[PDB]
Amino acid sequence: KQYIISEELISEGKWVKLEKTTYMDPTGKTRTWESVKRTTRKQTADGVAVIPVLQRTLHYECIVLVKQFRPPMGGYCIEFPAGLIDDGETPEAAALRELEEETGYKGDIAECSPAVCMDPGLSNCTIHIVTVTINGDDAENARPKPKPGDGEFVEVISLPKNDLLQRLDALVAEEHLTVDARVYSYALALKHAN
Amino acid sequence: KQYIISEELISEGKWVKLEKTTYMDPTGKTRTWESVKRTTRKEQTADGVAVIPVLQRTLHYECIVLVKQFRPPMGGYCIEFPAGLIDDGETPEAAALRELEEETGYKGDIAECSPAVCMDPGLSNCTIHIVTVTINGDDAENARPKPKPGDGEFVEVISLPKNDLLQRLDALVAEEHLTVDARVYSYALALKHA
Ligand SMILES: O=c1[nH]cnc2cc(F)ccc12
Numbered sequence: 378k379q380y381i382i383s384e385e386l387i388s389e390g391k392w393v394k395l396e397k398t399t400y401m402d403p404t405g406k407t408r409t410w411e412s413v414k415r416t417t418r419k420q421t422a423d424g425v426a427v428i429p430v431l432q433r434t435l436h437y438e439c440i441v442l443v444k445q446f447r448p449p450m451g452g453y454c455i456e457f458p459a460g461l462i463d464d465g466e467t468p469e470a471a472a473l474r475e476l477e478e479e480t481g482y483k484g485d486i487a488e489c490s491p492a493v494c495m496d497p498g499l500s501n502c503t504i505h506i507v508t509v510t511i512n513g514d515d516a517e518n519a520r521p522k523p524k525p526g527d528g529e530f531v532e533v534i535s536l537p538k539n540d541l542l543q544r545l546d547a548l549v550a551e552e553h554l555t556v557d558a559r560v561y562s563y564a565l566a567l568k569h570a571n
Numbered sequence: 572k573q574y575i576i577s578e579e580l581i582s583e584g585k586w587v588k589l590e591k592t593t594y595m596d597p598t599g600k601t602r603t604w605e606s607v608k609r610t611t612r613k614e615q616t617a618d619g620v621a622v623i624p625v626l627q628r629t630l631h632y633e634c635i636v637l638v639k640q641f642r643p644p645m646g647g648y649c650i651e652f653p654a655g656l657i658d659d660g661e662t663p664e665a666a667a668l669r670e671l672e673e674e675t676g677y678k679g680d681i682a683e684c685s686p687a688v689c690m691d692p693g694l695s696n697c698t699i700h701i702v703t704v705t706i707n708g709d710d711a712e713n714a715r716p717k718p719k720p721g722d723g724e725f726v727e728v729i730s731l732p733k734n735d736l737l738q739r740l741d742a743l744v745a746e747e748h749l750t751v752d753a754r755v756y757s758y759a760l761a762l763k764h765a
């Protein structure tokens with residue numbers, strides 16, 4: 378019933394562009410929307426986010442998260458390990474690569490979402506959410522070696538799965554961080570499943 | 572270590588602007604970033620709210636109430652938590668209850684309110700409160716609920732059982748061209764993982 382008529386480039390950076398979108402509302406009235414897109418999509422999605430489940434015998438299961446300075450936020454954020462999918466990279470392969478670069482952990486794919494939208498009122502940006510298990514007991518995950526690309530500075534924070542939401546709330550109240558909306562959504566559902 | 576040095580406006584729309592962010596990296600070196608922000612954030616603790624609406628009725632499984640809308644930036648229909656921007660002077664809780672009634676017809680009860688969480692912190696400074704709300708589906712107020720949609724708002728209500736949310740979203744993605752929101756998908760994954 379609704380569809381795009383035209384897109385007008387407003388401003389194109391190296392990484393991000395601003396468009397005015399003309400679309401038909403369901404009444405047959407023509408309307409405009411200010412929209413953001415990345416310049417980097419070629420891919421099933423722009424990015425991957427990894428839900429990394431660190432499994433060590435006789436330990437609580439942990440979710441592995443990363444803490445980074447985010448220039449748009451002007452502060453530190455707690456997030457699932459994540460990055461843009463390389464030209465000709467599979468979402469699964471991008472997930473294991475990003476997980477290893479950001480955490481040093483070597484993981485196994487459990488499941489992979491279809492492309493899901495990040496902020497569909499603002500942007501066309503999409504990701505694959507890739508569930509990965511990490512055998513914390515294997516030699517390769519003993520002293521995990523993180524491989525940061527140029528300009529990437531990442532701290533690893535592993536939090537117990539069974540208490541994730543209370544642990545995230547404590548970090549926010551203590552360390553003045555911003556928790557990622559997908560991390561918080563996952564944490565909430567772990568509590569609401571009961 | 573890291574902080575913002577300057578924010579240079581590149582392009583300002585009515586709703587969305589693009590900025591050149593100069594920040595200090597932790598090596599002590601000056602770097603830049605292309606950052607998106609909204610034009611609409613005054614004193615609000617966040618841009619917006621997203622509502623996790625748990626529809627509770629005697630001798631029914633709990634449902635998660637979702638909305639389906641055309642999203643110009645995506646060029647298609649999206650399944651999301653009910654959501655909108657926080658009005659100047661409005662609490663996150665009032666915005667959540669108001670957006671839920673406007674988009675679904677349901678009159679909710681506040682359960683929980685997150686801190687401000689980041690929508691896509693590599694791209695934008697955009698934040699929301701995630702507000703958990705219960706809906707007493709047994710109350711006559713919530714019997715034949717009519718969406719009161721705003722000018723240019725066209726919303727379909729989709730209520731899915733919490734106990735089968737991920738499978739029901741997967742069946743919707745199979746049967747038509749539609750994107751699930753990353754927060755809905757993250758919430759549905761955690762319900763499975765718990
Ligand atoms: O043009 C828009 N772009 C992004 N977000 C919006 C949010 C609104 F509420 C109205 C218009 C826009």
Ligand SMILES: O=c1[nH]cnc2cc(F)ccc12
Nearest residue numbers: 392393603604605606693694
């Ligand atoms: O300046 C940037 N803005 C948004 N996203 C990015 C993603 C990159 F991988 C590198 C730079 C940027």
Ligand SMILES: [Cl-]
Nearest residue numbers: 430487508764
């Ligand atoms: Cl798992």
Ligand SMILES: [Mg+2]
Nearest residue numbers: 458459460479
């Ligand atoms: Mg990353």
Ligand SMILES: [Mg+2]
Nearest residue numbers: 460478526529
């Ligand atoms: Mg990277």
Ligand SMILES: [Mg+2]
Nearest residue numbers: 653654655674
């Ligand atoms: Mg809305």
Ligand SMILES: [Mg+2]
Nearest residue numbers: 654655670673
């Ligand atoms: Mg609305």
